[PDB]
Amino acid sequence: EIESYCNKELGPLPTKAPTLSKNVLDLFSLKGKVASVTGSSGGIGWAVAEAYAQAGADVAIWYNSHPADEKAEHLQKTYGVHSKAYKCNISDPKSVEETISQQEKDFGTIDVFVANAGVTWTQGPEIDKIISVDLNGVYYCSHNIGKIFKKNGKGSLIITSSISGKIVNIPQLQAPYNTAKAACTHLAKSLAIEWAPFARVNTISPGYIDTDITDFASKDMKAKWWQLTPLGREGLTQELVGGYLYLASNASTFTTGSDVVIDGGYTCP
Template sequence: MANSLELFSLKGKVAFITGASTGIGLAVARAFAQAGADIAFGYNSSPSAIETAARLSQETGRKVVAYKVPVAQSAVVEQVVQDVANEFGKIDVVVSNAGITWTSGELIEPEDHKAWQEIIDVNVNGNYYVAKAVGRVFKSQGYGSLIFTSSISAQIVNIPQRQAAYNISKAAVTSLSKNLAVEWASFARVNSVSPGYTVTEITKFADAELKEQWKKLTPVGREALPDELVGAYIYFASNASTFTTGADLVIDGGYTLV
């Protein structure tokens, strides 16, 4: 029987993480590298992503290579996944984390469909494109672990802000994760993490008053820090979870309990 701590080691593994340049993605990339994984560091528009990846490599002693990957562009996703597989020789773990939020208010408010299309393109189609590309790699290898970043918003209607489009997109992510867990059961595991309100760039739209309301609705009385989420990702990425697939782990300070 393996040592319990060794089960959580990522030594020798290769992890591809989208949306890795900030927030949850960056915290996961750092945690994975500290746990022994080499990192394919996916980013889109961050001007400092390449420098961040280089600094992470220097800090952890792991191989970290930055890849520009706008997840809403299927052809680019396919090429980047192939580039990662060629560069590292394999892909053990993929964290499909890239996403955007909805700040347009009630669903009927925008005068055109641009905001809706953008959130569907990134949050729904982007996750599908990543899954499709890495699924081929996993099937060829005969193993792999795909982890989606979903949200508690997949399960609830957030208040007081109006964000139906975001909630719908995250519900799709959670459902995609569960469906792929069944479809891929013979060769890969698929799980999702659903954070509650977390201090990241994606929540910068919220003013102090709105954030105070979030805190009042959360039993522990505050937002999460990205580092408080990484244990879930390490579990799903590691050999500690070899019989875990189709799970959605909610980390929300008790928000969805009340």
């Protein structure tokens, strides 16, 4: 019998291909599935939550600062899906554990997880560049969600990352260049292999998107972006939402360990 070089828990090989719909549009359906989206009281995370609701999923919403029950109640009126909001401090392991357990018990499972790590940046008494992904909350999130995925034998986990050309740090790897994307890719490629018997794991790397994350900058700094972006502009949040659905749905049942770049072309070797 043929045994994996990557993970002997896959069993005798080959693992056997899923049964997909004959129709490509059905592949993108999240009807019947439960998504848990962090950072979904604004910016990317909200945009993704609403798309997932449009695709038929029940959506768990994460807030902390400003309550998001009206966003949850809006997903129900508008789309007739189940949605509840959860107050959680994403960097507290005990509440990330508490909150996932609460969502599983409330929805019955979690099929799709989007880890949107919260973002800071300094401000003293004074300003005139460097933003920070809280990778630790990603870690706590994936540790918890992985357990559920194993027990159910199915799961998609998307980690929001970044492009190399954006100076994005993690709190324990501060530098004047991007350190966060190597850290996310590592965390992603590692889980992809570990979780291979039961889940796919992937990253979305947005570029410069007109949203609460870069909407600290001035029109003069934003101008430096448009000049370097081959498409000549910033992205809209509605231009990431399709990729977050590609990765979460049965459209990507062979896609794991990957990074889909949505940056208007900014990467470019």
